[PDB]
Enzyme design. Structure first.
Site, PDB file in Angstrom:
ATOM      1  N   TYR A 189       0.736  -1.263   0.000  1.00  0.00           N
ATOM      2  CA  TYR A 189       0.000   0.000   0.000  1.00  0.00           C
ATOM      3  C   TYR A 189       0.763   1.310   0.000  1.00  0.00           C
ATOM      4  O   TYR A 189       0.287   2.290  -0.571  1.00  0.00           O
ATOM      5  CB  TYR A 189      -1.008  -0.017   1.153  1.00  0.00           C
ATOM      6  CG  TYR A 189      -1.930  -1.207   1.019  1.00  0.00           C
ATOM      7  CD1 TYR A 189      -2.972  -1.203   0.102  1.00  0.00           C
ATOM      8  CD2 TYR A 189      -1.666  -2.392   1.689  1.00  0.00           C
ATOM      9  CE1 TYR A 189      -3.736  -2.341  -0.126  1.00  0.00           C
ATOM     10  CE2 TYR A 189      -2.460  -3.514   1.512  1.00  0.00           C
ATOM     11  CZ  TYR A 189      -3.486  -3.490   0.591  1.00  0.00           C
ATOM     12  OH  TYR A 189      -4.269  -4.601   0.409  1.00  0.00           O
TER      13      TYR A 189
HETATM   14  C1  LIG Z   1       1.204   6.131   3.304  1.00  0.00           C
HETATM   15  C2  LIG Z   1       1.304   7.207   2.207  1.00  0.00           C
HETATM   16  O1  LIG Z   1       2.009   6.722   1.060  1.00  0.00           O
HETATM   17  P1  LIG Z   1       3.612   6.965   0.890  1.00  0.00           P
HETATM   18  O2  LIG Z   1       4.261   6.214   2.041  1.00  0.00           O
HETATM   19  O3  LIG Z   1       3.792   8.445   1.068  1.00  0.00           O
HETATM   20  O4  LIG Z   1       3.951   6.453  -0.505  1.00  0.00           O
HETATM   21  C3  LIG Z   1      -0.077   7.665   1.746  1.00  0.00           C
HETATM   22  N1  LIG Z   1      -0.812   6.501   1.279  1.00  0.00           N
HETATM   23  C4  LIG Z   1      -1.847   6.015   1.965  1.00  0.00           C
HETATM   24  O5  LIG Z   1      -2.191   6.525   3.017  1.00  0.00           O
HETATM   25  C5  LIG Z   1      -2.578   4.817   1.392  1.00  0.00           C
HETATM   26  C6  LIG Z   1      -3.959   4.611   2.041  1.00  0.00           C
HETATM   27  C7  LIG Z   1      -4.774   3.500   1.371  1.00  0.00           C
HETATM   28  C8  LIG Z   1      -4.076   2.122   1.410  1.00  0.00           C
HETATM   29  C9  LIG Z   1      -4.315   1.429   2.752  1.00  0.00           C
HETATM   30  C10 LIG Z   1      -5.783   1.088   2.926  1.00  0.00           C
HETATM   31  S1  LIG Z   1      -5.996   0.195   4.490  1.00  0.00           S
HETATM   32  C11 LIG Z   1       0.079   8.714   0.667  1.00  0.00           C
HETATM   33  O6  LIG Z   1      -0.298   8.469  -0.513  1.00  0.00           O
HETATM   34  O7  LIG Z   1       0.599   9.816   0.983  1.00  0.00           O
END
Ligand SMILES: C[C@@H](OP(=O)(O)O)[C@H](NC(=O)CCCCCCS)C(=O)O
Ligand SMILES: C[C@@H](OP(=O)(O)O)[C@H](NC(=O)CCCCCCS)C(=O)O
Ligand SMILES: C[C@H](O)CO[C@@H](C)CO[C@H](C)CO
Ligand SMILES: O=S(=O)(O)CCS
Ligand SMILES: [Cl-]
Ligand SMILES: [Cl-]
Ligand SMILES: [Cl-]
Ligand SMILES: [Cl-]
Ligand SMILES: [Cl-]
Ligand SMILES: [K+]
Ligand SMILES: [K+]
Ligand SMILES: [K+]
Ligand SMILES: [K+]
Ligand SMILES: [K+]
Ligand SMILES: [K+]
Ligand SMILES: [K+]
Ligand SMILES: [K+]
Ligand SMILES: [K+]
Ligand SMILES: [K+]
Ligand SMILES: [K+]
Ligand SMILES: [K+]
Ligand SMILES: [K+]
Ligand SMILES: [K+]
Ligand SMILES: [K+]
Ligand code: NA
Ligand code: NA
Ligand SMILES: [Xe]
Ligand SMILES: [Xe]
Ligand SMILES: [Xe]
Ligand SMILES: [Xe]
Ligand SMILES: [Xe]
Ligand SMILES: [Xe]
Ligand SMILES: [Xe]
Ligand SMILES: [Xe]
Ligand SMILES: [Xe]
Lengths: 265, 466, 591, 466
Positions: free
Chosen positions: D390
């Site tokens: 994710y």
């Molecule tokens: C963690 C973070 O991603 P990065 O670590 O920054 O790549 C963040 N994504 C998320 O929060 C993904 C949420 C959905 C996937 C999990 C569902 S339980 C974002 O896009 O900024």
């Protein structure tokens, strides 16, 4: 007081530009408009109607202690607190006695307390209502208003670049301005609203008169800004407007690289 | 090397404040008053106790017409809340509360100052204003400089307020989110303390157009409201904030440092009385008369000279001192706005004067206008975005951080402050509408309201250092 | 030899005359005699559709009789348009995912303004969607982690299985889990993944269905340059569903591929569910080794990666594929034709930044500001002016494209001649002046033609674009009018900012973009700069201008939009013959 | 009121550094070393002259594989550039240039200092490093505090480098954008100086999760690289940066001030040698042995006591000092990570230890774990986002500003620094990969590399003030 030169005027076209913008040069009156017809054409207020206000009279608004403000007398419109109204005019690309940027330069040199925008298809002038009325006498009645090539229109302004009509008139989608019995008349006001009686502007200037008084360069009449062979030629061999253009580009480019680079240039 | 050239600083009445001041002594990197101005903006916040009290009382928390409804007349709604109407409806009160924050403003002020204070003699201040409805807070330099950010006065005041209100009134657990909302608004769902009751003169730290733009993200209406429309003091505040901003942007450096310092001195501090003299000479005229006065003054002072006379008689002028010529155009620019928008006592035309004062200057001399293109560029963008459907707004909502007006290197926003100061009330989004609290509260700070004299006195204190 | 706007090179069509049925040199026209909108097939049909819509929904909508003061639109001719240069094309006749193969050399004339409106043209919308749904990554680090941390060998065979699995799960399926929902393949048939490499032995070892073949797509000299930059590395190019970006934004692409590529690595290499190595795959895709079409934007115009606003001008230049077409390689009498590259690259350059972005993100409304931008890729106007500057310079300097010494003086000479020629034709042809009735159209066109000539003739992109800004006095001092109210903000300031190095003023044109402050608001500019950057690189013998990975990433016949011939593609959308991706036909009731 | 309770500060070798220190003397609002640490992060930048020289020379400007190509063999490409091949092809060079920046590093550093310096002896420093490939720059407090932002060292250094390189080599107009690109990268199309050659330890000022988070947007890999993997010094640097961050967030205020100060003292500064003692006692065991040692030490110190014995014999413990109990759980947390990840010499399990050390603590005592839910909450999020498809990454890429790990109030990032310090090279995105330059250049600053002794000595200097 330093005496302004306004802009390079080495030929008939640029000399016409200088006349328009120099405030010490009287623009000759070429038509008379009654107060009723003049106000009807503007379309903001009719003869005898009281001026509307946007704020109370200046003397009642409690202006703060401000020495600089005391050096600038307010206009009569500002003293009364009149609404700021807009008048819009359009000049055809075909040999007009005044064009768009010359309007901005002229307005800023001849009229006090203005707001003004230049567009390719129109030019706005926005001032306190009574001040705007006084300015419009110059815009509508003098040599800078050829009835067929410089028209008033508050919106649906297309026509500056359109082909002239069979009578040499500039196109108006709303048909505010028409040709009747050889005269140019406004059959609707600047807002396209009905008028009790048309406003007669008189005859348009002849083609040779238009060519003589125009402020625009046009390649078709053999008078382009840049002639064949001028590109790259020495300054002394080109029009002063092109020598001025080259100088501004050189100084903006070198000055913005390092300011000291244009010292003595 | 130090900017040792001497200038005279004149007040808005055209009389000298301080003579023989080296240009170096008015720069943001040296001048104690200019530096204190930035320090005040960083450390000062206002707590709207009246707003916080009303939000808790009625449930109109935050902004956007939000309302957490408590219904005190459930038994009169004509509904049954029990199956078959077995039990009559009973109202509850779960999202609102009445706290006498304004009545207790004095005690709250003492408790807030003690929470914010690091050491007893640290300079922390908390003043009760508007009969208890607002508190003006200025945290100490000790607390403000703990880390690297400028938002510490905002963050600490919101938490100290929330904590002290919860403790003072011994509120139950249900109150925690609601009291936090009364001060923080929608934070942290929003980065801003949106619709909250802790206000800074600075924008949220997420909003810059680039690094170093914080001191530029201040609307012209705020500047005019804080200086109470005194034209040149508004010009001085705007120009000084733009001067600090340009230092933080990294543009008051090397071969551009003198050019940037002169914009601030000449356009913002009436150096050598140029702004005043130009307005005095051309005040009864038009924008064009300011153009004539500007070129004449530049010639009189030896800043420009005739370079070449073309066959028609038109003369090209040369800049003997290019950075000073630019600074004289910036001074003429604010003078032109004072004369033009001053005659109409209507700010709207400021964008037209910005464009055509510069365009007329080039056509008149054959020299580049302010910013080698930015003066006319912003005259164009600012005109467009203050008279079209696309975006923008009235002159007073622009700032050095607004995408429409950010480009000019410090000489554009001060002319907007001048024009809006001279406006007779022709706009709907004027200083009273967007900056009422700012002007009433932060306008009481002498340095923000009247910076000209403070900068000149501080420059005279260090004039012998350079 | 007449101007191209009076006689197209091969079809001999008179693009200006066809608008009026009258000699365009005559300064005369009859107005108020066309029946208003009745002269327009699209607006007349729109009026009848609007009446049915109003009856069905109970709220009025399109009603031409609301036009101000009883003046219906159409008091003058509502001109039709001809796509520039389609009669000079001879290649690109292959079937595409959006339409059967175009017959090269066939014109598209008589298009109405509404047919080239971004709102009504799916080719323009797909053009943008193909850019933003693309995710690009180096795979070296993911392969390194598998070999060093996990302990498994990476071979052509495991890479092929990885791509077969990624092509299964990028749009439609699941591989590892039981009882998992999946997407209808019909809704995501435009989604897939491929790779390219500079290693010819590795390229030949992979399943060609997953390969972007640099040797096939590019001419030898360009393939050599690109492969030298790519080197012995593998780059993945994945395109997520168009329907998916239409429910969110382009920033979804790197996140989406982060999920699916991670899963294809887990399944192709048998990695346990929950192993620590998994986080290196998503980190590599989203941040560690990634190439974005667009960078993030600040708070006022907040955007994650891959919004049109974050796309650098050079990236818009390099995603265009006209640089590798036969027309661009031997169109100038057997020689390279940088002008063909400029005029094509500026078409999506203008339409995407102005209609797709400034309009469809920052402002909006029903017009798409279409006539402003239509003028830059129709009726051979800008085409004639651009080629005029090239022929003039080749004869004056006695050299080929990209060989005029890049001095400020030579830039000024060429700009003065192109401005002169542009003004000569607008002045001598009242019908052309009326066709490009907006001053911005005429001003942008002389500035773009000047920049195209300087850029193509010197190979210098900053000097080419400097010629654009020099057109401000040349245009203004001649006509005493320029463009719309706020058109010359950037032109005035860039006469000084082009060679400035102040904090937010200095930056090479390749890396400028819609977030460079001067360019963040106004139409009629950015696309022109994009064309100039592409043409300057083409003229000096380069295969791209800014990023070889972007150039290779868009050399793909499976793209919904044909990035080689954008003017033609926009015309095909104008004919309602472009089938975009992203439609939800498979799961909606008949219609 | 002052935090007058006394603590002893111990070094990482388990020997006392300073005794009888009031808790108040180690807080970021008072301690000169902690305050100087924030000042160094704000004012220091590195200039990569080698990188700038390479970008200009080959055209590989900025990041993302960008390359502005210059073709020196146009006549050998097999193409005709003239119609019909009338003229042979000639190559041009228009996007690249060779400047001897590295060879001229000494003189470049001198010109850079003169441009950055405001007054002689103002403390501005430029140090040549890596045989001329890198310059370490630290601007003066005078320049840094001109305005309100922390980015002044970054902005001024980029402009100063650009201007001095243009002047030193008297470059022509064509070089202006290219030299600007060599230092600024993609700025201003990007807010960041993306792919540029002027680096700060702080992130771009647009990147905060909220106001006051700047000191929290620092990756654990940077902290480990700057402390050269000395476990407790990495814990001290991380905990101290989180302590400054929490002050700037407004959370070290009022009834939460002591709680927040104790997290920093106990987990970050080995107060009373608790961290060292727990690791010493349970080092040969598992996470569970640290749980036993933590509960035992809390009982020994009178922090907790038996509250009630249930019929089964299970005892509920009560916190006699709730903020100190939380701080003892935070100390036990970093000790548990040192024991567990230390035994494997592999950082990955840090997220599991964060979750289960806290979960075991609650099940063992009936008292809440660190942060009343945040310790286990972040153990869950951090475990998930370091082992799933994710998002996230390996432990070293997280920070107090990362959405995954920001929640805990200062006690989570220091355990990541401890685990990554003990890692034997099991990750691909380890300190060498993401923070090589950071560790080589900023790691030379004694305060950043070894803060424990500096904080203790500074706390002893002001111990009598409270
Ligand atoms: C963690 C973070 O991603 P990065 O670590 O920054 O790549 C963040 N994504 C998320 O929060 C993904 C949420 C959905 C996937 C999990 C569902 S339980 C974002 O896009 O900024
Ligand atoms: C100006 C600004 O709008 P605001 O003044 O912030 O409302 C900005 N819009 C734009 O730049 C609109 C650009 C498109 C319209 C002009 C076409 S020439 C924006 O959305 O951030
Ligand atoms: C402003 C002036 O005419 C510029 O002169 C150029 C033609 C040559 O520049 C030299 C230096
Ligand atoms: O008239 S304006 O120039 O403001 C807008 C043109 S669409
Ligand atoms: Cl806020
Ligand atoms: Cl807000
Ligand atoms: Cl090198
Ligand atoms: Cl940065
Ligand atoms: Cl406590
Ligand atoms: K001449
Ligand atoms: K109330
Ligand atoms: K309640
Ligand atoms: K206190
Ligand atoms: K604010
Ligand atoms: K200077
Ligand atoms: K009608
Ligand atoms: K293939
Ligand atoms: K690099
Ligand atoms: K060069
Ligand atoms: K040397
Ligand atoms: K200095
Ligand atoms: K400071
Ligand atoms: K950084
Ligand atoms: K050292
Ligand atoms: Na009458
Ligand atoms: Na030159
Ligand atoms: Xe008129
Ligand atoms: Xe003329
Ligand atoms: Xe203000
Ligand atoms: Xe001055
Ligand atoms: Xe527009
Ligand atoms: Xe100009
Ligand atoms: Xe264009
Ligand atoms: Xe660090
Ligand atoms: Xe402690």
């Amino acid at each position: 007081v330093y005496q302004r030169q306004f802009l390079p005027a080495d030929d008939r076209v640029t000399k016409n530009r200088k006349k328009v913008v120099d405030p010490s040069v009287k623009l000759e009156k070429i038509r008379t408009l009654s107060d009723k017809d003049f106000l009807t054409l503007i379309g903001h207020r009719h003869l005898g109607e009281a001026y509307r206000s946007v704020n109370p009279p200046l003397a009642e608004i409690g202006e703060p202690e401000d020495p600089i403000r005391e050096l600038v007398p307010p206009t009569e419109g500002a003293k009364a607190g009149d609404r700021v109204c807009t008048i819009i005019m359009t000049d055809s690309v075909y040999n007009p006695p005044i064009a768009h940027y010359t309007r901005a330069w002229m307005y800023h040199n001849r009229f006090r307390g203005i707001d003004n925008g230049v567009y390719s298809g129109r030019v706005t002038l926005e001032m306190r209502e009574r001040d705007l009325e006084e300015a419009c006498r110059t815009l509508f009645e003098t040599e800078i208003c050829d009835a067929s090539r410089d028209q008033v229109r508050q919106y649906t302004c297309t026509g500056h670049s359109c082909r002239l009509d069979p009578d040499g008139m500039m196109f108006d989608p709303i048909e505010r301005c028409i040709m009747s019995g050889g005269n140019v008349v406004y059959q609707k006001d600047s807002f396209g609203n009905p008028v009790d009686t048309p406003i007669n502007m008189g005859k348009p200037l002849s083609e040779e008169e238009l060519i003589e008084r125009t402020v625009v360069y046009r390649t078709d009449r053999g008078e382009p800004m840049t002639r064949e062979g001028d590109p790259g030629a020495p300054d002394e061999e080109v029009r002063e407007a092109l020598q001025w253009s080259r100088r501004i580009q050189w100084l903006r480019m070198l000055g913005n690289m390092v300011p000291d680079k244009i010292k003595g240039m | 090397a130090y900017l040792t050239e001497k200038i005279d600083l004149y007040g808005d009445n055209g009389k000298v404040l301080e003579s023989d001041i080296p240009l170096e002594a008015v720069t943001p990197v040296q001048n104690p008053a200019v530096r204190e101005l930035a320090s005040i903006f960083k450390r000062s916040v206002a707590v709207n106790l009246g707003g916080a009290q009303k939000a808790l009382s009625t449930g109109h928390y935050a902004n956007e017409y939000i309302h957490f409804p408590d219904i005190p007349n459930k038994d009169k709604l004509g509904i049954k809340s029990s199956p078959g109407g077995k039990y009559p409806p009973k109202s509850v009160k779960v999202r609102t509360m009445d706290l006498p924050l304004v009545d207790d403003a004095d005690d709250i002020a003492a408790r807030l100052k003690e929470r914010l204070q690091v050491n007893p003699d640290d300079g922390t201040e908390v003043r009760v204003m508007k009969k208890g409805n607002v508190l003006y807070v200025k945290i100490s330099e000790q607390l403000a400089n703990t880390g690297v950010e400028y938002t510490t006065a905002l963050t600490t005041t919101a938490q100290a307020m929330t904590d002290l209100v919860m403790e003072k009134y011994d509120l139950d657990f249900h109150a925690s989110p609601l009291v936090h909302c009364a001060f923080y608004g929608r934070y942290p769902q929003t980065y801003e303390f949106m619709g909250g009751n802790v206000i800074s003169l600075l924008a949220a730290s997420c909003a810059n157009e680039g690094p170093g733009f914080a001191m530029r993200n201040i609307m012209a209406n705020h500047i005019v409201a804080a200086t109470r429309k005194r034209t040149l003091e508004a010009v001085a505040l705007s120009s000084t904030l733009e001067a600090i901003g340009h230092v933080e942007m990294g543009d008051a450096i090397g071969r551009w440092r003198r050019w940037q310092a002169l914009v601030h001195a000449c356009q913002g501090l009436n150096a050598n009385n140029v702004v005043y003299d130009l307005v005095k000479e051309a005040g009864h005229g038009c924008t064009g008369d300011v153009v004539a006065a500007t070129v004449g003054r530049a010639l009189e002072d030896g800043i420009i000279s005739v370079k070449k006379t073309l066959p028609s008689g038109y003369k090209f002028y040369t800049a003997n001192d290019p950075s000073m010529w630019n600074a004289y155009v910036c001074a003429g620019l604010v003078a032109a706005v004072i004369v033009n928008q001053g005659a109409a006592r209507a700010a709207q035309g400021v964008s037209s004067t910005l464009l055509y004062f510069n365009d007329l200057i080039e056509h008149e001399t054959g020299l580049p206008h302010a910013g080698y293109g930015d003066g006319m560029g912003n005259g164009v963008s600012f005109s467009f975005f203050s008279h079209a459907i696309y975006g923008g707004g009235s002159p007073g909502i622009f700032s050095g951080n607004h995408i429409v007006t950010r480009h000019s290197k410090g000489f554009a926003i001060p002319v907007i402050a001048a024009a809006v100061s001279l406006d007779s009330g022709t706009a709907v989004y004027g200083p009273e509408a967007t900056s009422g609290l700012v002007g009433d509260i932060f306008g009481e700070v002498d340095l923000i309201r009247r910076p000209m004299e403070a900068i000149a006195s501080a420059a005279a204190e260090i004039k012998d250092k350079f | 030899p007449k101007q191209l706007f009076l006689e197209s090179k091969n079809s001999k069509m008179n693009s200006i005359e066809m608008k009026y049925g009258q000699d365009p040199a005559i300064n005369r026209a009859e107005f108020h005699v066309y029946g208003g909108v009745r002269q327009s097939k699209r607006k007349s049909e729109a009026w009848e559709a609007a009446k049915r819509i109003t009856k069905e929904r109970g709220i009025p909508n399109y009603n031409p009789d609301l036009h101000l003061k009883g003046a219906q639109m159409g008091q003058k001719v509502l001109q039709t348009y001809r796509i520039t240069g389609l009669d000079r094309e001879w290649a690109g006749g292959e079937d595409t995912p959006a339409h059967k193969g175009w017959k090269p050399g066939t014109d598209i004339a008589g298009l109405e303004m509404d047919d080239l409106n971004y709102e009504n043209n799916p080719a323009m919308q797909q053009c943008y969607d193909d850019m933003r749904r693309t995710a690009i990554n180096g795979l070296s680090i993911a392969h390194e982690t598998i070999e060093r941390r996990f302990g498994k060998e990476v071979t052509p065979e495991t890479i092929n299985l990885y791509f077969e699995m990624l092509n299964h799960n990028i749009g439609a399926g699941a591989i590892m889990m039981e009882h998992t929902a999946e997407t209808n393949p019909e809704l995501v048939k435009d989604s897939y993944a491929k790779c390219f490499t500079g290693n010819d032995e590795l390229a030949d070892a992979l399943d060609q269905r997953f390969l972007i073949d640099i040797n096939k797509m590019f001419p030898k000299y360009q393939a050599d340059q690109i492969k030298a930059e790519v080197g012995d590395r593998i780059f993945q190019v994945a395109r997520i569903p168009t329907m998916a970006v239409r429910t969110s934004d382009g920033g979804l692409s790197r996140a989406w591929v982060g999920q699916q590529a991670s899963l294809a690595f887990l399944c192709a290499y048998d990695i346990p569910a929950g192993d620590a190595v998994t986080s290196d795959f998503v980190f590599t895709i989203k941040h560690g080794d990634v190439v974005f079409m667009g960078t993030q934007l600040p708070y006022r115009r907040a955007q994650r990666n891959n919004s049109a606003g974050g796309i650098a001008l050079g990236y818009y230049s390099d995603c265009n594929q006209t640089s590798r077409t036969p027309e661009a390689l031997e169109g100038l009498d057997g020689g390279i034709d940088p002008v063909k590259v400029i005029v094509e690259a500026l078409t999506p350059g203008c339409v995407i930044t102005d209609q797709g972005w400034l309009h469809n993100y920052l402002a909006g409304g029903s017009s798409g500001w279409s006539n402003y931008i239509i003028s830059v890729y129709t009726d051979e106007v800008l085409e004639d002016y651009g080629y005029h500057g090239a022929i003039y310079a080749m004869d004056k300097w006695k050299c080929g494209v990209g060989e005029v010494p890049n001095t400020y003086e030579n830039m000024m000479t060429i700009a003065e001649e192109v401005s002169r020629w542009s003004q000569k034709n607008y002045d001598e042809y009242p019908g052309l002046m009326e066709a490009h009735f907006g001053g911005s159209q005429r001003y942008s066109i002389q500035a773009a033609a000047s920049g195209a000539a300087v850029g193509a003739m010197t190979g210098d992109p900053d000097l080419g674009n400097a010629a654009w800004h020099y057109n401000t006095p040349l245009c203004k001092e001649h006509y005493l009018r320029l463009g719309f109210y706020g058109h010359d903000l950037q032109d005035q300031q860039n006469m000084g900012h082009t060679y400035s190095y102040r904090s937010d003023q200095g930056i090479p044109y390749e890396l400028k973009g819609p977030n460079y402050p001067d360019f963040a608001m106004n139409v009629g500019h950015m696309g022109g700069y994009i064309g100039i950057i592409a043409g300057a690189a083409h003229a000096r013998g380069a295969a791209y201008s800014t990023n070889p990975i972007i150039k290779a990433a868009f050399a793909d016949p499976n793209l919904q939009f044909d990035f080689r011939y954008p003017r033609r593609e926009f015309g095909i959308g104008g004919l309602r013959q472009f089938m975009p991706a992203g439609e939800r036909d498979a799961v909606i009731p008949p219609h």
